[PDB]
Amino acid sequence: PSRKAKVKATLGEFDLRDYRNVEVLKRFLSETGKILPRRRTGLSGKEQRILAKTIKRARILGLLPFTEKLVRK
Amino acid sequence: MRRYEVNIVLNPNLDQSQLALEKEIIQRALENYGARVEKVEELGLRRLAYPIAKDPQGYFLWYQVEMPEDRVNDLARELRIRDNVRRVMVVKSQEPFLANA
Amino acid sequence: PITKEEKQKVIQEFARFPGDTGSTEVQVALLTLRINRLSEHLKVHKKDHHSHRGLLMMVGQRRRLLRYLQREDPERYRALIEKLGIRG
Amino acid sequence: KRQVASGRAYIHASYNNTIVTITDPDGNPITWSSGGVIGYKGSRKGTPYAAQLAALDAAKKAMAYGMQSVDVIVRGTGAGREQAIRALQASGLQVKSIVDDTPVPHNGCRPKKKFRKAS
RNA sequence: CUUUCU
RNA sequence: GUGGGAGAGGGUGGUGGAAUUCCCGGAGUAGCGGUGAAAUGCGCAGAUACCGGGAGGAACGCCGAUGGCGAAGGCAGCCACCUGGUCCACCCGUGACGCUGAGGCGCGAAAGCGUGGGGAGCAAACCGGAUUAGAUACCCGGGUAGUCCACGCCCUAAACGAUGCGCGCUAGGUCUCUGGGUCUCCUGGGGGCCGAAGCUAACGCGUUAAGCGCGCCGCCUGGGGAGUACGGCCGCAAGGC
Ligand SMILES: CN[C@H]1C[C@@H](N)[C@H](O)[C@@H](O[C@@H]2O[C@H](CO)[C@H](O)[C@@H]3O[C@@]4(O[C@@H]([C@@H](N)CO)[C@H](O)[C@@H](O)[C@H]4O)O[C@@H]23)[C@@H]1O
Ligand SMILES: [Mg+2]
Ligand SMILES: [Mg+2]
Ligand SMILES: [Mg+2]
Ligand SMILES: [Mg+2]
Ligand SMILES: [Mg+2]
Ligand SMILES: [Mg+2]
Ligand SMILES: [Mg+2]
Ligand SMILES: [Mg+2]
Ligand SMILES: [Mg+2]
Ligand SMILES: [Mg+2]
Ligand SMILES: [Mg+2]
Ligand SMILES: [Mg+2]
């Protein structure tokens, strides 16, 4: 289904241009440093597109992950 | 001129003197290139998502400047010279594009 | 780039009368401005062919406006050329 | 002959064979097994059955160093990966956790013709 | 695996 | 002109992590690899699998699309500088200044050429294994040019939407990207699908025309011989026109 409730929903208004709110950004990555698909991130073409650049900036700053190990399996 | 944001992360193992020193050269370096500080934030230490120069934490700095654009790239050549400065990142400032607001 | 000052500073400098934003003298003026900066940028970045097209475009648009000028008022023309510093 | 107990179990599964390497709490391998380790010589090597006999052997051999608590780290999808995991889960060793850590490039080198025709 | 000709 | 907007459009520099290869160190043994089976190959000078360190080259996962940008070729990690195109709103300025375009000049994927540099992975040729009746192949193991960079040359292509450019006119419906608005929809630009009229040999096209008209360019005139001969021009050559 993928309808585990959008990520934009469970979250208040936030600046998407801010590449340091590791608290909020952390939210758009899966059980790995992977940027969630629109149909999960709940974002929009423009939004989503900006988010993605915001998330990449972070990573470089070391604030956000590039990739995580998968627990279970 | 133009408005930028300079992110600087350095060795989390700096004693009051060493640390307060790097900022000396930074503050200096900024000036030497036309950087006019509009304000600063110092979050300090933060658990990096992954190790940087073997070190699993980092000391963050944040300066918002206004300086001759034609020298932003040089300003940061300088900033990276330091051995404790392990990550420098300048950014054009931008309106805080909201969302879900 | 060209600041709003840089620009308007030229517009007034050529405008046929207060408010003349797009006469032929003006247009030829602003174009000569861009064409110079651009041809300046290409003095270097010779490999930047894409930007070069834009040059050819402006260069066209320009002589095409001058052509019209030198046709309507041969005087305003010689005036504009000697001034802007075109031909050579 | 060291006595470890708590440790890591690395399962390197591939469609060509499975190899298990049990190690200490910080990397250095203790004992390793594989398809070849046990009889199986060629094609048979890959099989999930071997993936078992290998896991077990790895553990048995590891039981000698006095193993017990182990953390499984799977690497690569292949003929009998889940099988190795189950084998360990049995054996004796207590499987504390399991984690996919298979490596994936962020698009680095051009794969052999063998694995191209992607994009 | 391949696996021609009529 | 003023005010905004989106964008992998282009150029120079810088920089981030994933992975591969190599080298060093540890721990650790008897195999690893590879296939349909195998073998060559690598491994006790200790390989594979595991951990830590280093070097180097090249590409840039998720986001990513059914998306976007460019005139085309084509363009995607991040950052900054330089820079092209383009769209919307206000309707403010000039006052037909317009369109097309033989020749010209420029651009032009890949392979290829010249000088120099670089070389991790991949890999024409080539050296081997296997398969086969044979195997100058498919499969497996190696591997040189090359792929990378600079400067210069080459100028071709299923260089494709196989659909020249500009303008006007002719139902709608739906999805989408981007701008404006009185923002459960209206309006402008762009990308898709279904479809009125109409068009078409059919397939199909259908406000993104392949419909109705006007302007200008290129081109076709049965198949083979043949993109060959010859001549001329260009090219270092291969070769191109
Ligand atoms: C006319 N000149 C030649 C042209 C050849 N290309 C052809 O293979 C020859 O012979 C026959 O040609 C036919 C059309 O090309 C065909 O397809 C026959 O199949 C053939 O049958 C077998 C023979 N036992 C009989 O010729 C062999 O497998 C081959 O020669 C094989 O091509 O003969 C073939 C023929 O004579
Ligand atoms: Mg622009
Ligand atoms: Mg008016
Ligand atoms: Mg008038
Ligand atoms: Mg070319
Ligand atoms: Mg090439
Ligand atoms: Mg060469
Ligand atoms: Mg080969
Ligand atoms: Mg090879
Ligand atoms: Mg439309
Ligand atoms: Mg009909
Ligand atoms: Mg249709
Ligand atoms: Mg000649």
Side-chain angles (χ1 to χ4, degrees):
Chain A
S2 176
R3 299 290 182 178
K4 324 163 188 176
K6 267 48 188 173
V7 186
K8 176 190 169 188
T10 298
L11 184 49
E13 56 122 287
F14 56 94
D15 180 19
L16 261 176
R17 197 142 282 156
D18 172 45
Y19 57 81
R20 295 187 295 166
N21 192 186
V22 192
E23 359 295 66
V24 78
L25 311 187
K26 200 195 308 171
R27 286 291 201 57
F28 303 146
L29 294 180
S30 60
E31 303 56 56
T32 307
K34 299 186 186 180
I35 297 175
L36 285 141
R38 270 268 234 66
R39 22 82 64 163
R40 290 280 287 78
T41 67
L43 282 185
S44 74
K46 190 176 174 183
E47 299 182 312
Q48 171 69 16
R49 184 194 320 154
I50 325 173
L51 165 66
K53 222 181 190 184
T54 281
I55 293 179
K56 283 169 194 175
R57 287 179 158 182
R59 292 177 172 164
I60 222 174
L61 286 182
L63 295 165
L64 280 168
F66 277 74
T67 189
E68 314 293 53
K69 298 188 166 188
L70 192 56
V71 175
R72 279 288 197 307
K73 202 188 189 197
Chain B
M1 299 183 272
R2 295 180 194 153
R3 217 182 198 183
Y4 305 99
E5 279 185 44
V6 180
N7 289 274
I8 299 190
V9 188
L10 28 77
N11 223 313
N13 307 310
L14 300 188
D15 61 57
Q16 176 48 51
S17 298
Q18 302 163 174
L19 176 161
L21 166 64
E22 300 293 46
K23 305 189 58 185
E24 159 56 60
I25 309 181
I26 294 182
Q27 287 295 172
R28 210 189 198 78
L30 291 161
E31 262 204 305
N32 304 165
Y33 283 105
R36 170 196 167 306
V37 184
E38 295 192 4
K39 75 176 181 181
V40 38
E41 290 179 52
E42 198 171 1
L43 292 286
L45 292 192
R46 290 205 64 183
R47 314 311 166 194
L48 303 180
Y50 59 98
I52 290 188
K54 323 308 165 186
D55 207 301
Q57 324 164 185
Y59 193 76
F60 296 71
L61 290 175
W62 190 85
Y63 307 138
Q64 165 173 292
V65 324
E66 172 189 299
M67 61 176 271
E69 351 73 291
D70 65 305
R71 299 226 302 180
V72 174
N73 257 280
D74 302 322
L75 180 292
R77 285 180 188 168
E78 198 64 52
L79 293 193
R80 309 176 200 302
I81 305 176
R82 297 276 71 193
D83 305 2
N84 290 279
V85 172
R86 25 195 64 171
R87 282 279 217 293
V88 193
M89 182 174 92
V90 188
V91 173
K92 276 227 200 67
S93 301
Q94 307 183 200
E95 304 58 50
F97 180 89
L98 300 180
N100 187 280
Chain C
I2 315 79
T3 63
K4 299 183 181 180
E5 348 294 307
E6 272 288 57
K7 189 169 188 169
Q8 293 189 56
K9 154 56 194 172
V10 170
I11 303 181
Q12 292 174 163
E13 175 56 10
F14 290 86
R16 307 282 312 311
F17 52 81
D20 173 10
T21 81
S23 279
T24 311
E25 286 78 357
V26 189
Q27 271 174 45
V28 174
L30 296 74
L31 277 190
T32 304
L33 195 180
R34 302 189 62 211
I35 267 179
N36 283 164
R37 301 300 207 62
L38 191 157
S39 291
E40 189 53 9
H41 151 63
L42 299 180
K43 293 268 186 176
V44 196
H45 311 63
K46 300 182 180 180
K47 287 179 296 179
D48 182 339
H49 303 308
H50 283 48
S51 285
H52 186 277
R53 185 192 172 217
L55 174 70
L56 265 39
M57 301 222 267
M58 310 173 305
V59 183
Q61 189 52 31
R62 186 166 75 174
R63 20 187 298 294
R64 200 157 52 267
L65 284 201
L66 291 168
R67 172 193 290 145
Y68 162 77
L69 197 296
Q70 178 251 62
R71 168 149 48 77
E72 289 315 309
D73 185 320
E75 190 35 54
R76 284 199 294 173
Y77 181 64
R78 297 148 197 169
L80 209 179
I81 285 193
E82 172 260 61
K83 198 172 172 189
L84 276 190
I86 286 172
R87 292 268 217 165
Chain D
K1 297 179 182 180
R2 289 188 177 186
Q3 308 316 291
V4 181
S6 58
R8 284 137 71 165
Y10 278 88
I11 307 185
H12 174 72
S14 97
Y15 288 83
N16 271 332
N17 176 41
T18 303
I19 130 154
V20 191
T21 291
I22 325 289
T23 187
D24 69 1
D26 50 6
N28 318 94
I30 283 169
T31 67
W32 68 278
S33 187
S34 77
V37 164
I38 321 154
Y40 299 160
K41 264 211 65 180
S43 188
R44 326 281 258 62
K45 214 181 305 178
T47 185
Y49 181 52
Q52 179 171 60
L53 297 200
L56 299 178
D57 182 24
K60 295 179 184 177
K61 290 186 182 181
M63 305 283 249
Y65 283 54
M67 277 285 279
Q68 281 172 54
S69 174
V70 190
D71 305 61
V72 188
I73 298 179
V74 272
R75 289 266 185 59
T77 303
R81 177 225 300 157
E82 229 49 47
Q83 248 314 301
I85 296 177
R86 290 142 71 160
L88 293 179
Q89 295 196 293
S91 61
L93 311 173
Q94 182 177 65
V95 185
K96 287 299 172 186
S97 65
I98 306 180
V99 178
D100 169 299
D101 192 64
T102 315
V104 51
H106 291 18
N107 285 276
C109 302
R110 165 183 263 219
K112 324 173 60 188
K113 177 164 136 201
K114 236 247 175 189
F115 311 76
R116 295 214 71 236
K117 283 308 181 60
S119 67

